[PDB]
């Protein structure tokens, strides 16, 4: 009996298949989150600066109140 190297292909490994595809981001939907984070960013920040004004006037009031200084 002769024994040589046997042939096997099975699945053929798929000859040239695309793996690159669009994922997560679509296009217009990313701008809704992108610019949406900006509008949420300013509104949250400016409310803190209005709360800073409560401290600001109260800080300068200490100088006016102190005349024996």
């Amino acid at each position: 009996x002769x024994x040589x190297x046997x042939x096997x292909x099975x699945x053929x490994x798929x000859x040239x298949x695309x793996x690159x595809x669009x994922x997560x981001x679509x296009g217009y939907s990313m701008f809704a989150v992108g610019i949406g984070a900006l509008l949420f960013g300013y509104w949250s920040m400016m409310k803190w600066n209005r709360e800073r004004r409560r401290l600001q006037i109260e800080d300068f009031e200490a100088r006016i109140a102190l005349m024996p200084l």
Binding site: X3, X4, X5, X6, X7, X8, X9, X10, X11, X13
Partner: protein, 54 residues
Amino acid sequence: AMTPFFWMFEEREKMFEFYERVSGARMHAAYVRPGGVHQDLPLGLMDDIYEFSK
């Protein structure tokens, strides 16, 4: 670019396992000759080519 060199050389080092099992040295082989092919493929290699290509 640093990554694409090392990403492929892991796979490329597996390629010289085919060469070592088919001929003496790692890189250069006196394998292809005017009389066709010097030595036949061993029984282990033909299953490994399919396993690599997958």
